[PDB]
Design a binder for this molecule. Structure first.
Ligand SMILES: [Zn+2]
Ligand SMILES: [Zn+2]
Ligand SMILES: [Zn+2]
Lengths: 78, 104, 585, 187, 187
RNA sequence: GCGGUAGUAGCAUGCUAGGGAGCAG
RNA sequence: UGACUGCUCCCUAGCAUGCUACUACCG
């Protein structure tokens, strides 16, 4: 339902973050792997929507890499 | 993530709240301290002296569960190998798979 | 690997194997291209080759597809069907095929040396995309032939200004260093930074553009990338816009120009326009005009080189804010004066080399001459603007047509931008006779530019003319002109103010040698981009073929302001020209 | 089926043996004709089975080809696709914290670290313009990721410590607006 | 089939029978018209069913012999790669400090675990945290395995050069911690 | 009237090899 | 970077057997 839609968006969020060569900083890849392994083992949709803000904020703090504007005006959340 | 299969399953009444069938098998990721932390589980192997008068009898009741078979040495032309395209170890995975060394 | 046969507009997945660019051909081009022209090779998602230990019969001739692979005749596991049969070649899209009525496109262009007149003239009567592919094949043939040349090297470091260089032995070696040699060095087994070197003079004298550190064994060879496919046409249909709606006009209007509001309204109610402009014909000061009059308009400015951009940037920061320009630098001659690494502005300049694609509204480029349709296509695909005002001239400083073997074609028959104009007519009226004098304008508008410019400013009776035939004496590898440079020097001594000019010549070695006893800076002829000066010494030769063939340098005469010096040995450009005639002493 | 070169033998002989019973003849003629029908019938039920196998075989090789060509365009476009997948999936969740840090980081308010979940939890974002500051924070209170933080320090481009009283659609045009606001979580 | 030695009989028997159809053939010559291309045709088919078997057999040794060649060429490329190793890992034995323990040995046999421990020139220490660092590798020199080693480089997990002043008690939270110290032997 | 013999085409079974994929300890 | 075994489904190539029609000689 809602706990299975968060558990599949955190598999696509650590693949976008693994294709951007975030594996080359082993002080931040060690936190992203702990916020993704912890969401998958969660048993409440109120304590897995707050590790999805920490994990998503890693992608929005990486500047140029992902064009957020283009990707949001691409028939998606406006 | 196979999103088509998940969409199809959800559109057929699956993964509802309070269901008997949930997702519990995943692909778990690991960091760079994973191989050494798994090797270090060899600290559970401690030297162990056995009871020899008891083990010398157990080993004789155990070799009776293996009496209906046959065995022996075989020549190099009777050996059966499946999937010759699998690794060949250290000092060698640098030059080929098991096929190279079974052919050379 | 599913491209497109744009020889038919057909969507296919094959390509000619032993061909120039390996382009996408359908089942009806790749059927007849192989039988007549020996391109017995096709490339698909998997190459059409034998698939059995040792085979060397790779000709999609009678190859039979069976058992999930392409077998052969000689050894026959035939039990299948041939690859080429019933006017088609096997592959995907084997049903949705159209065909072409012009069979001998590859049969004529994929075998020749891409330099014959017939190929060019039939190219200039093709469509836009076929000619885009023809221009990409011209770039591709240039780059393919770029790796069939020589290599320089240094194995012995000597004292400065006296080195030695050997290129190669027994192979067919002239090159007007136009694009200079930056190879990379080697010391033992790896690559070592060396920099960029320039070889002009040449034991063998060596000049220095910048300080460097020679090492033993350093090689020099050029590597050039492959031009990527583009997705935009070159020209656009004529379609007048509804109104000038959607713009932000300004209350103030210039008053030193008497042809400004008319042309502003014209570009307001016109979509695309092309002209024939010599140097100093609005490229100097009208760009600032449209900049100030149209503020909100996203005007993009680019040249083929940063040095023609410098011409407008020098004074583009006095009257207007400094931040009004923005160019990127790579990590070609440039200089870090502006604010670099800033690709966001209202008047974002541009470069032919590379620039990110964000937005644009007005097309205005400087001289676009030294390139084929490639430049128009790369600038139309890089950014698509609402209005097009093509400044410059299609025939101003044309790109040298690599290896010439059969004369030179008539300018009238250029790629796309010269015959259209002189078959439909001029679109706009524009002229800047402020810098240029009339002595040049009269003849230049008499030859090709009839009734386009007016004789505004007079002449101070300074132009130098002396009919001298001279004697030419060629050698095994070069030739030096005795008479004409000597008489030029003798004429220069008769005026006291003649030692503040430059030393420009058709050949770099000639002026370099002649400067060792006069003391003048070395200069060459590649493109006098946005660089106008008063005094100049002009020369030619070898006329007959290299200099006296066509008016390759008619527009280029307009650099001076009160007079120029241009001797000529023929009787075709002085029949009515009135350069002051005088006799030798 | 038809159009096969060996088809004008199972037509003539088929028509002949056929009509042959109305007119009729000796048994010899009938046997002769049947021993031409079968002689030129095998030639048809052999060239229309080999074709029957080639026509389906062809439609298999030209299907592995369709797989080796879609599976090389599915792999060369990975990057462009998983970023579209993620944002198609992020809209459907319709969360409130997730739909705030996304809208905020589209106008400019991106963070400079990970969003911490603790109670001290220092944060650093970059407000680019005055309107984004006015909407987000008023006073010493800051709203972000559906949580409330308390501003502890404001810093302009280099090290310019802005006091909260001098950022007000006024003194504001006089600074380098990409600020670096530091805050701590609340409770 | 143009060189099978049984084409002559077949060709002639066809000509005799087939070509002589228009000419009036009695019921006695018809046997020759029939039982002359027959038998000959049977033999030809026999001469073609053996040729087809000889061809396939032949094209099963001109494929199994490319594979015996391939493998020997390969056997010579690995036999020359292990040789180029066992002669490059040998020019690296400081044969003054190695011939000094094989000599003090009773018979010349020594444990292998004491060869890198007593005859090596470089030491690599991998350190998890800061507490372990000050009890193992403090200062520019340290003693280990009854020797004295002097530090030469301290890279980290990312492989970026660290200096011996970034390693504080409180700067430690700011380093990729598996730290690798490379030291050289002294005296 | 039937049987045997040698080729040819067509339909299923088992076995021997190669290739891709799924599960288990 | 990709271990050792066992089972099992699908596709292609080759070998032998099993009821038929076609050939042709032979009875
Ligand atoms: Zn070709
Ligand atoms: Zn085509
Ligand atoms: Zn073959």
């Amino acid at each position: 339902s809602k706990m299975s839609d968060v558990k599949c968006t955190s598999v696509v969020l650590l693949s976008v973050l693994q294709q951007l060569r975030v594996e080359s900083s082993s002080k931040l890849w060690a936190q992203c792997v702990q916020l993704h392994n912890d969401i998958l083992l969660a048993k409440d949709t109120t304590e897995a929507f707050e590790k999805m803000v920490s994990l998503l904020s890693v992608l929005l703090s990486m500047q140029g890499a992902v064009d957020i504007n283009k990707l949001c005006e691409e028939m998606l959340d406006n | 993530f196979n999103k088509d299969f998940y969409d199809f399953a959800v559109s057929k009444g699956f993964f509802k709240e309070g269901s008997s069938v949930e997702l519990k098998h995943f692909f778990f990721a690991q960091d760079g301290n994973a191989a050494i932390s798994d090797y270090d589980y060899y600290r559970y192997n401690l030297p162990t002296m056995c009871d020899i008068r008891q083990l010398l009898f157990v080993v004789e009741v155990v070799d009776k569960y293996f009496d209906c078979y046959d065995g022996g040495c075989i020549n190099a032309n009777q050996v059966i190998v499946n999937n010759l395209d699998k690794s060949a170890g250290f000092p060698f995975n640098k030059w080929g798979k098991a096929r190279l060394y079974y052919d050379s | 690997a599913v491209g497109a046969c744009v020889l038919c507009n057909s969507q296919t997945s094959l390509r000619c194997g032993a061909c120039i660019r390996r382009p996408f051909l359908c089942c009806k081009c790749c059927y007849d291209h192989v039988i007549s022209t020996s391109h017995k090779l096709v490339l698909s998602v998997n190459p059409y080759v034998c698939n059995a230990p040792g085979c060397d019969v790779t000709d999609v001739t009678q190859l039979y597809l069976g058992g999930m692979s392409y077998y052969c005749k000689s050894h026959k596991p035939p039990i299948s069907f041939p690859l080429c049969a019933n006017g088609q070649v096997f592959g995907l899209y084997k049903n949705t095929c159209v065909g072409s009525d012009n069979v001998t496109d590859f049969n004529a262009i994929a075998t020749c040396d891409w330099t014959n007149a017939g190929d060019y003239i039939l190219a200039n009567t093709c469509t836009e995309r076929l000619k885009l592919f023809a221009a990409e094949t011209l770039k591709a043939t240039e780059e393919t032939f770029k790796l069939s040349y020589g290599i320089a090297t240094v194995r012995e470091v000597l004292s400065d200004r006296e080195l030695h260089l050997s290129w190669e032995v027994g192979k067919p070696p002239p090159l007007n260093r136009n694009y200079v040699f930056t190879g990379y060095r080697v010391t033992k087994n790896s690559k070592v930074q060396i920099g960029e070197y320039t070889f002009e003079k040449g034991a063998v004298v060596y000049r220095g553009t910048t300080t460097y550190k020679l090492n033993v064994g350093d090689y020099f060879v050029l590597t050039s990338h492959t031009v990527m496919p583009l997705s935009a046409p070159t020209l656009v249909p004529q379609e007048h816009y509804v109104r000038i709606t959607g713009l932000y006009p300004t209350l103030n209007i210039s008053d030193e120009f008497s042809s400004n509001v008319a042309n502003y309204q014209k570009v307001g109610m016109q979509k695309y326009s092309t002209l024939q402009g010599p140097p100093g014909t609005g490229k100097s000061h009208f760009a600032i005009g449209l900049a100030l009059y149209y503020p909100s308009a996203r005007i993009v400015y680019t040249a083929c080189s940063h040095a023609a951009v410098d011409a407008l940037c020098e004074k583009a920061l006095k009257y207007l804010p400094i931040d009004k320009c923005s160019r990127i630098i790579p990590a070609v001659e440039c200089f870090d004066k502006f604010k670099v690494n800033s690709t966001l502005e209202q008047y974002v300049f541009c470069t032919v080399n590379a620039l990110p694609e964000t937005t644009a509204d007005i097309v205005v480029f400087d001289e676009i001459s030294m390139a084929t349709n490639y430049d128009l296509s790369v600038v139309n695909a890089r950014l698509r603007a609402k209005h097009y005002v093509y400044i410059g001239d299609p025939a101003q400083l044309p790109a040298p047509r690599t290896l010439l073997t059969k004369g030179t074609l008539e300018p009238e028959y250029f790629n796309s931008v010269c015959r259209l104009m002189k078959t439909i007519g001029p679109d706009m009226f524009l002229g800047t006779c402020r810098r240029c004098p009339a002595e040049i304008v009269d003849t230049v508008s008499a030859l090709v530019y009839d009734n386009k410019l007016k004789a505004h400013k007079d002449k101070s009776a300074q132009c130098f003319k002396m009919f001298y035939k001279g004697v030419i004496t060629h050698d095994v590898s070069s030739a030096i002109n005795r008479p004409q440079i000597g008489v030029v020097r003798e004429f220069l001594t008769r005026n006291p103010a003649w030692r503040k000019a430059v030393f420009i010549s058709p050949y770099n070695s000639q002026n370099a040698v002649a400067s060792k006893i006069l003391g003048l800076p070395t200069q060459t002829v590649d493109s006098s981009q946005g660089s106008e000066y008063d005094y100049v010494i002009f020369t030619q030769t070898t006329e007959t073929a290299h200099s006296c063939n066509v008016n390759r340098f008619n527009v280029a005469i307009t650099r001076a302001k009160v007079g120029i010096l241009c001797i000529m040995s023929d009787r075709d450009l002085y029949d009515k020209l009135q350069f002051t005639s005088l006799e030798i002493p | 089926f038809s159009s096969l070169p060996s088809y004008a033998a199972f037509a003539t002989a088929q028509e002949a043996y056929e009509q042959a019973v109305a007119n009729g003849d000796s048994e010899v003629v009938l046997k002769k004709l049947k021993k031409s029908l079968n002689v030129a019938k095998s030639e048809f039920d052999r060239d229309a089975a080999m074709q029957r196998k080639l026509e389906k075989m062809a439609d298999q090789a030209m299907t592995q080809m369709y797989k080796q060509a879609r599976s090389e365009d599915k792999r060369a476009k990975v990057t462009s696709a998983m970023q579209t997948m993620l944002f198609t999936m992020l809209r459907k969740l319709d969360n409130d914290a997730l739909n705030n840090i996304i809208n905020n980081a589209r106008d400019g308010c991106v963070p400079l670290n990970i969003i911490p979940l603790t109670t001290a939890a220092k944060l650093m974002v970059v407000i680019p313009d005055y309107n984004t500051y006015k909407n987000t924070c008023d006073g010493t209170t800051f709203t972000y990721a559906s949580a409330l933080w308390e501003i502890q320090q404001v810093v302009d481009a280099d090290s310019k410590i802005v006091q909260l009283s001098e950022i007000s659609m006024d003194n504001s045009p006089n600074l380098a607006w990409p600020l670096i606001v530091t805050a701590l979580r609340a409770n």
